[PDB]
Amino acid sequence: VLSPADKTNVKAAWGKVGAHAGEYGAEALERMFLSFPTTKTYFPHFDLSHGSAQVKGHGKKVADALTNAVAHVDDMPNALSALSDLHAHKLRVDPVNFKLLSHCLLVTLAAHLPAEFTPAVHASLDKFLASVSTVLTSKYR
Amino acid sequence: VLSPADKTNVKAAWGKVGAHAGEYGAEALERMFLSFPTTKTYFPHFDLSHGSAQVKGHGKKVADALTNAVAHVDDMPNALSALSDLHAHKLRVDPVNFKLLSHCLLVTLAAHLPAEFTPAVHASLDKFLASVSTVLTSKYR
Amino acid sequence: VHLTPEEKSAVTALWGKVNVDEVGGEALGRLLVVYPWTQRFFESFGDLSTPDAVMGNPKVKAHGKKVLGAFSDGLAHLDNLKGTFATLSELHCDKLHVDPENFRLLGNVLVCVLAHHFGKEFTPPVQAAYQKVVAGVANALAHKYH
Amino acid sequence: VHLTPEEKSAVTALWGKVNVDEVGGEALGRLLVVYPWTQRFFESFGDLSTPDAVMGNPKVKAHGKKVLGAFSDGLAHLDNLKGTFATLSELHCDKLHVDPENFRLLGNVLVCVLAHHFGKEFTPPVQAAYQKVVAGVANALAHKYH
Numbered sequence: 141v142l143s144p145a146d147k148t149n150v151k152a153a154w155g156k157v158g159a160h161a162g163e164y165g166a167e168a169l170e171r172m173f174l175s176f177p178t179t180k181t182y183f184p185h186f187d188l189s190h191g192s193a194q195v196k197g198h199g200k201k202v203a204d205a206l207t208n209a210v211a212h213v214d215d216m217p218n219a220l221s222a223l224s225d226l227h228a229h230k231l232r233v234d235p236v237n238f239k240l241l242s243h244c245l246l247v248t249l250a251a252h253l254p255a256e257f258t259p260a261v262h263a264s265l266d267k268f269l270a271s272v273s274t275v276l277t278s279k280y281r
Numbered sequence: 282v283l284s285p286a287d288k289t290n291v292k293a294a295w296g297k298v299g300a301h302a303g304e305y306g307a308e309a310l311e312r313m314f315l316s317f318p319t320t321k322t323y324f325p326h327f328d329l330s331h332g333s334a335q336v337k338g339h340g341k342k343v344a345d346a347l348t349n350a351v352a353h354v355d356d357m358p359n360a361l362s363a364l365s366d367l368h369a370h371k372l373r374v375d376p377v378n379f380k381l382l383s384h385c386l387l388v389t390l391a392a393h394l395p396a397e398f399t400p401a402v403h404a405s406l407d408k409f410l411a412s413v414s415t416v417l418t419s420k421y422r
Numbered sequence: 423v424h425l426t427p428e429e430k431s432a433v434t435a436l437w438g439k440v441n442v443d444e445v446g447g448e449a450l451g452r453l454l455v456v457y458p459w460t461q462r463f464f465e466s467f468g469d470l471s472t473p474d475a476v477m478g479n480p481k482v483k484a485h486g487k488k489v490l491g492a493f494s495d496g497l498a499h500l501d502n503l504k505g506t507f508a509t510l511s512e513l514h515c516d517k518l519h520v521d522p523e524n525f526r527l528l529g530n531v532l533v534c535v536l537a538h539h540f541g542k543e544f545t546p547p548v549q550a551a552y553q554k555v556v557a558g559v560a561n562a563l564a565h566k567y568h
Numbered sequence: 569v570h571l572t573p574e575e576k577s578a579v580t581a582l583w584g585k586v587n588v589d590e591v592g593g594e595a596l597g598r599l600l601v602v603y604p605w606t607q608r609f610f611e612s613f614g615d616l617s618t619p620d621a622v623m624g625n626p627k628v629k630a631h632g633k634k635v636l637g638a639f640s641d642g643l644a645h646l647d648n649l650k651g652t653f654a655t656l657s658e659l660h661c662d663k664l665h666v667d668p669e670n671f672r673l674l675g676n677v678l679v680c681v682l683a684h685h686f687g688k689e690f691t692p693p694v695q696a697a698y699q700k701v702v703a704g705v706a707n708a709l710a711h712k713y714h
């Protein structure tokens with residue numbers, strides 16, 4: 141469960157990201173595709189090279205979904221219900237892959253937030269991304 | 282979430298187990314120590330010999346906890362609260378290990394339930410053991 | 423992986439009694455029932471909408487027999503699994519786009535099918551030997567991914 | 569494991585700029601804060617009750633120096649990491665009773681620390697090379713657990 145301090149920490153860190161949210165989403169995807177090549181099996185129709193239009197567009201959508209989750213942190217199951225239906229019934233991404241994107245989102249934030257990425261904020265962000273991942277896999281069977 | 286069909290399948294299968302529950306808990310533990318040797322790091326204070334009295338005693342405690350969970354399947358977070366406290370604050374077993382014991386319990390049931398272990402009952406039992414494991418790790422951080 | 427002489431004897435003794443046709447069909451069918459997201463690769467196979475539809479589907483049965491036949495051939499090469507499966511690994515990555523976590527899920531279902539069929543004969547030491555084998559085969563099929 | 573000559577080169581170039589004593593204390597401390605069940609091995613270290621109590625604990629800082637020192641020495645010997653870390657694998661299994669999942673958790677925290685320190689210099693290709701490194705070291709430390 142996310143504590144009051146966890147929610148404060150997540151809102152402060154994502155607030156500092158601000159207008160850079162979309163750029164950071166695309167960078168996290170690129171980091172995932174290079175570090176964990178098995179994740180590329182889900183995008184056989186994409187150009188996956190650095191700077192590709194398809195990766196830029198997808199990164200913006202991922203970022204905007206995270207912004208919505210932060211805004212609705214008290215009730216994420218209801219805020220993310222349509223997105224959890226899409227992953228369970230159509231996309232059918234194996235649940236193991238959500239931890240890989242989560243780690244790459246953390247590494248991206250660490251590389252861009254020298255002052256804000258403290259040990260306490262790191263812990264809270266890891267809990268938050270695990271909770272998002274759990275909602276997105278909750279309807280698979 | 283566990284469906285009405287899942288709950289009916291789990292009650293029927295665990296009922297057929299009956300008075301063998303304890304014997305089956307000890308067998309599942311031995312299957313885990315042999316198949317997944319990293320799990321032995323949690324039991325250096327035990328004699329792990331085949332037929333060990335300490336393994337038999339621990340198998341009975343694990344099986345009795347499962348029986349309680351089946352009886353209170355409509356509210357497992359409350360039924361398992363004391364056991365979830367113990368694992369989070371004292372024992373501190375890494376969360377990756379719960380899937381390993383879950384698999385070995387499923388294999389033990391398969392070896393003992395020829396008529397009952399249909400494809401649908403296999404699916405329901407896998408979901409049930411994953412739900413118990415989620416409750417037992419819910420207070421870790 | 424590396425098996426002991428005792429583990430190798432246990433694997434070969436049990437496999438000589440396996441009906442590869444039946445066990446292959448049963449293992450692939452239970453993968454699609456228990457982990458239903460794995461149906462994503464099998465759009466062309468027809469009705470997969472209930473447990474009985476999946477288990478009785480002729481295309482599911484034929485593909486399970488094919489997959490388990492290749493697994494069977496690999497058991498003659500236990501000290502060289504990565505070399506044995508290299509061409510197949512390449513194919514599953516480049517042509518079929520199959521996430522290798524699927525091979526680990528199939529290995530676990532196969533262990534459950536062997537236990538269901540053999541009962542008390544599938545002892546804890548026999549299971550441990552088979553766990554080493556399915557982990558080795560999954561790792562070999564994952565090895566050429568890029 | 570399967571580092572390319574240009575990746576080996578990128579690992580060594582970055583590591584030449586690292587203060588091993590400092591990064592080691594920081595990585596072990598963050599492990600114990602982010603994944604607090606890992607504190608189970610360290611009851612003798614005293615106060616671990618808050619993030620600041622962990623990060624500034626003198627016994628935590630001293631152990632992090634020892635652990636990352638041994639990691640640093642191994643980066644010089646990339647052809648056979650299993651052989652290089654064999655003595656330490658045997659110790660962690662037979663004397664210390666440490667689940668190897670702990671090595672994988674520490675690897676991911678180390679990658680986070682390297683990104684936090686270097687910023688834009690820790691590029692996506694550099695991260696991919698370090699992911700191979702930390703996986704290789706964790707697999708080597710896990711190897712003697714039989």
Ligand code: HEM
Binds near residue numbers: 182198223273276
């Ligand atoms: C933090 C976790 C994740 C979030 C917030 C997320 C969010 C999203 C969103 C917002 C979309 C667009 C839906 C639309 O078209 O309106 C999408 C699509 C998609 N996602 Fe997820 N996702 C996550 C994890 C993953 C992972 C781990 C994978 C696979 C490695 C994945 C694979 C896909 C694929 C293949 C699509 C369709 C892309 C296309 O064809 O344009 N997702 N996701």
Ligand code: HEM
Binds near residue numbers: 320343382413
């Ligand atoms: C289905 C999952 C599990 C259940 C239902 C369960 C249940 C229990 C129970 C009932 C006890 C005894 C509490 C008492 O009366 O003192 C116990 C203790 C313990 N458990 Fe868990 N457990 C599970 C998973 C695990 C796993 C996966 C591990 C490690 C691989 C583990 C390691 C331990 C240890 C080391 C003890 C203390 C044993 C002793 O010293 O006697 N447990 N557990």
Ligand code: HEM
Binds near residue numbers: 488520528
């Ligand atoms: C023991 C593990 C496995 C082995 C040894 C294996 C082997 C094979 C073989 C020999 C073929 C025929 C290749 C050819 O055209 O020459 C094949 C095809 C295929 N396999 Fe695998 N396989 C395994 C696991 C899986 C899993 C778990 C899945 C997905 C859930 C999968 C998906 C496919 C698909 C989609 C095809 C093409 C089917 C068709 O078009 O008829 N395989 N496999």
Ligand code: HEM
Binds near residue numbers: 606635639656666709
């Ligand atoms: C990069 C991975 C690691 C390396 C290279 C490493 C290396 C070492 C070394 C060199 C020692 C001193 C050994 C001696 O006395 O000869 C040691 C001790 C020890 N390590 Fe590891 N280690 C690693 C990860 C870990 C992790 C993740 C944990 C647990 C969270 C751990 C737990 C311990 C413990 C409990 C001791 C004994 C400390 C004491 O005396 O109280 N190690 N390690």
